[PDB]
Each structure stands twice: as structure tokens, then as C-alpha cells.
Design a protein around this nucleic acid. Structure first.
Ligand SMILES: Nc1ncnc2c1ncn2[C@H]1C[C@H](O)[C@@H](COP(=O)(O)OP(=O)(O)OP(=O)(O)O)O1
Ligand SMILES: [Ca+2]
Ligand SMILES: [K+]
Length: 430
DNA sequence: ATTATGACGCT
DNA sequence: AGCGTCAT
């Protein structure tokens, strides 16, 4: 009891831009605003591949990884915006730059960890302490939480969505004011007030809307964020965990959506995260390893200690192109021309990164896929990255991969290559 | 022919 | 070092 950790020491948020690439395109082109629309890359094969979908289009069943020609069958009036193509490949610069806009705003409020192009974790513990000092015992008004859901509420003894949201918020605040909750619950509530302010600043200063989760750790904040999308935020308290986890499929928890989660389900014969509480820590470690077992034991009780890392910039800068089916690269000249295209994009991005961020990459990683191999990468080799020069990088990448060509004819490449990837890594200050 | 990324773990 | 997993 009095010595059992409860993982309530931090306030962590996860902010996730709504349908991010779509919003970037809708800001630029007002004709796309408030419409079913999607972002596509390429166009020739089946209309292009959809990579982002507005909520209006999701209502018709349009999803990521769908061909645009197929999405048009579900939604004939679907509008499309195409990712820019440069040097023969998709170029994501517009979205990376829009991401920097949002990350820089978030950084004014607290330390952030860039989790993805449109996702960041926020460690709000210190900001919450400061705001509590400012509040000076003053109650928190529902007006400060206009887009917040309290997971699990309302409960106990309105048929519209917003009505339910307000009922749950009122129950939560009523119990905080009466002193029937805990200090961690108050800390989370102040965290949610700050996240409302952060999200309002993002929308004011960029036009972009987002969703957010507020809880005591990264996994719960991530889970919380997805509960009420789009343009809403969700507070998951420690006390909400048993009910929330009691019907939560294991695959919904970050890191458990793949083979490990499937093995947890199969080996233990369970379905929901809460069912993990019935195993000892040693049992879980025996099946899933020391690290995973301790993580699962704490996580199923709502406890996780992974820190929000102070990192706003990506740690690698990479450029990749697939060459599917009949387009697989089958001559040496083809391989060299495409390595050059990739290296030219990489050089441009690296030179900009060095000027903006006072750092230089020192390692070049070259990865390829051969036709027939089921794995995304068939081979990875590294070499020194000593000059930001596209011809040198493309020649070096060729040097490190040239021995993979089985073909007895030097001019021919076999087996054909279905993917090329260049990645700059190992940054040092400059 | 579900593409272009990006972080992190294992040995 | 090179490979594998998980995720957006
Ligand atoms: N598999 C992918 N391939 C290519 N681009 C992707 C992929 N997944 C995500 N992206 C890009 C497009 C998305 O706009 C952006 C953020 O991804 P993600 O958060 O999963 O979805 P989303 O922002 O489009 O919608 P949501 O509102 O559900 O968050 O990253
Ligand atoms: Ca998103
Ligand atoms: K995201």
C-alpha cells in the first residue's frame, strides 16, 4: 500500500495533428477546406496512393493505403492534392516545414519529444507546478477546458455529444472542487488547461487543428489522444485505468500492435490489456524477456517510466524510393541515375539542416531491396559521409552495394532492385 | 504495386 | 556493424 508506486509523478501530453498532410494542403488551397479530400502520391498507377484522409472523406470509408481510383468508388466527389515530385520522386519538404511550424510553437510551452512528423510528447510537470502556484487555490472553471473529455465520465445516476462531454467534465471538476480527487488528478487537470492553451496557439498561429491526450506517462497520453478525435483532447486519469483497460484490445497500446502483442495474446490466452494484471512480473518476464516483462507488468497497471526525451529535431535525414513490379531497376546505369537523384535530394536537405541546426551528419547508410525478398530491406551498408556532395555520396553508395549484383554482365543488374534508400546519420555539432 | 519515411532494440 | 520490429 504505502510503498506501492502508482506512476503519478509526471504530467505528460501527446499532441497529434489531425489528418496532417490534408490540413497542410487545405491551408494552401481554400477550395479543399471542409470537403472530403485526401493527399496522394504519384498518379499513374491506379490514380496514386492515398497517404492522408480528411474526416469528411473518412465518413465514406476512404483510408490510407488505398488507391485513389478505389477511393473514388466510395466517394466520387473526393478531392485530391498530390505530393510534390522532384527528381522523379515524392518530395515531402512542404510537410516537414509545416511540422517545424508546429514544433516550434509547442516548444514555447514545454520540452517536447518529436515522435513523428506530426506528433510530439510534452512533459508538463514543471509548467503545471508553476501554473498551480499562479492559480493560488482558485478553482478551475469548465470554461478553461472547452474541448476536453474526461475518460470514464459521466457515470452513475442529454443525447448529444457535446452534452455528454460537458456532463463528464462537470462531474470531474465538481469532485476536484469538493476535494474528492487526488493531487495527481489536479495536476492532470492543470495540464489539460495548458494543453488547451497550446492547441489554441497552434491553431491561431498556423491554422492547424490537433488532438491531444493528457495523462501521467507517454503510453497513456498516446492512448488518450486517440479516444476523441478530431480537434479534441482527452484526460486519462490514473483511476480511469482499470475500467479503460478492462475492454481495451492489447494491440491498441503503443508497441503492442505487432508480433509481440500477438504473442502476448496467444501465449497467455487473453484479449484485453487489463487481463495482464493476473500474471506475476516473473511470469511475464519468462515469456517476453526481462525488459518487456517488467514493462508489461507496470503498463497494465497504468505505470510507465519512459521519459519525454528533449529532442525536437529528427536524428536522421533519409531519402527512399521503391521500384515495384515491372519498374524494378535492372541495369547498372539505372541504379546509378537513381542513386544520384536520391543523393541530390539528400544533399539539399543536409545543406539546409546544417545551416538551420548547427550540425553535420557523419555516416551515410545505404539500403536496398532485391526483387523476391519479402523484407523491406535486403541489405544495409554504411560508409563515411565526409562531404555534402551528391555525386560523391551516390558514387560511395554504389561502391558499397555494387558487389550485390549477381549478373555476369557488368551492365546488367540482377536480381533487379525494388528499393533504394540513402540515410544520413551520426550528427555532430558544427 | 500499402510509399516514404523515422526511432529504437538485438546480437 | 547489420538486421529486425514498430510506428507514422
Ligand atoms: N504509412 C504512411 N505512409 C506515408 N505517409 C504517412 C503514413 N502514415 C502517416 N503518414 C503521414 C501522412 C499523415 O498526414 C501524417 C500523420 O500521420 P497520422 O497521424 O497517422 O495520420 P493523420 O495525421 O493523417 O490523421 P489523424 O487525424 O488520424 O491523426 O503522416
Ligand atoms: Ca495525426
Ligand atoms: K501522428
Amino acid at each position: 500500500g504505502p510503498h506501492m508506486a502508482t506512476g503519478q509523478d509526471r504530467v505528460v501530453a501527446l499532441v497529434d495533428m489531425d489528418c496532417f498532410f490534408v490540413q497542410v494542403e487545405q491551408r494552401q488551397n481554400p477550395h479543399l477546406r471542409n470537403k472530403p479530400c485526401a493527399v496522394v502520391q504519384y498518379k499513374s498507377w491506379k490514380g496514386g496512393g492515398i497517404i492522408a484522409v480528411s474526416y469528411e472523406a473518412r465518413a465514406f470509408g476512404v483510408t490510407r493505403s488505398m488507391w485513389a481510383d478505389d477511393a473514388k468508388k466510395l466517394c466520387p466527389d473526393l478531392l485530391l492534392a498530390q505530393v510534390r515530385e522532384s527528381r522523379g520522386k515524392a518530395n515531402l519538404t512542404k510537410y516537414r516545414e509545416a511540422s517545424v511550424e508546429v514544433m516550434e510553437i509547442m516548444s514555447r510551452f514545454a520540452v517536447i519529444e518529436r515522435a513523428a512528423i506530426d506528433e510530439a510528447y510534452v512533459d508538463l510537470t514543471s509548467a503545471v507546478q508553476e501554473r498551480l502556484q499562479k492559480l493560488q487555490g482558485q478553482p478551475i472553471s469548465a470554461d478553461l477546458l472547452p474541448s476536453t473529455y474526461i475518460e470514464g465520465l459521466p457515470q452513475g445516476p442529454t443525447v448529444q455529444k457535446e452534452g455528454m462531454r460537458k456532463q463528464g467534465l462537470f462531474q470531474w471538476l465538481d469532485s476536484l472542487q469538493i476535494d474528492n480527487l487526488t493531487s495527481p488528478d489536479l495536476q492532470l487537470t492543470v495540464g489539460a488547461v495548458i494543453v488547451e492553451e497550446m492547441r489554441a496557439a497552434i491553431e491561431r498561429e498556423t491554422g492547424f487543428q490537433c488532438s491531444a491526450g493528457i495523462s501521467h506517462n507517454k503510453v497513456l497520453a498516446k492512448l488518450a489522444c486517440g479516444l476523441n478525435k478530431p480537434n479534441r483532447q482527452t484526460l486519462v486519469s490514473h483511476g480511469s485505468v482499470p475500467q479503460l483497460f478492462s475492454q481495451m484490445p492489447i494491440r491498441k497500446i503503443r508497441s503492442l500492435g505487432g508480433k509481440l502483442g500477438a504473442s502476448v495474446i496467444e501465449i497467455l490466452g487473453i484479449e484485453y490489456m487489463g487481463e495482464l494484471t493476473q500474471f506475476t512480473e516473473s511470469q511475464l518476464q519468462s515469456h517476453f524477456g526481462e525488459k518487456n516483462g517488467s514493462w508489461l507488468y507496470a503498463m497494465c497497471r497504468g505505470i510507465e517510466h519512459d521519459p519525454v526525451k528533449p529532442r525536437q529535431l529528427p536524428k536522421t535525414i533519409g531519402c527512399s524510393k521503391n521500384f515495384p513490379g515491372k519498374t524494378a531497376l535492372a541495369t547498372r546505369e539505372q541504379v546509378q541515375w537513381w542513386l544520384l537523384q536520391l543523393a541530390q535530394e539528400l544533399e539539399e536537405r543536409l545543406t539546409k539542416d546544417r545551416n538551420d541546426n548547427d550540425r553535420v551528419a557523419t555516416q551515410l547508410v545505404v539500403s536496398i531491396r532485391v526483387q523476391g525478398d519479402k523484407r523491406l530491406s535486403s541489405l544495409r551498408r554504411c560508409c563515411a559521409l565526409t562531404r555534402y556532395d551528391a555525386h560523391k555520396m551516390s558514387h560511395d553508395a554504389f561502391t558499397v552495394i555494387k558487389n550485390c549484383n549477381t549478373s555476369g554482365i557488368q551492365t546488367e543488374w540482377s536480381p533487379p532492385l525494388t528499393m533504394l534508400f540513402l540515410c544520413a546519420t551520426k550528427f555532430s555539432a558544427s
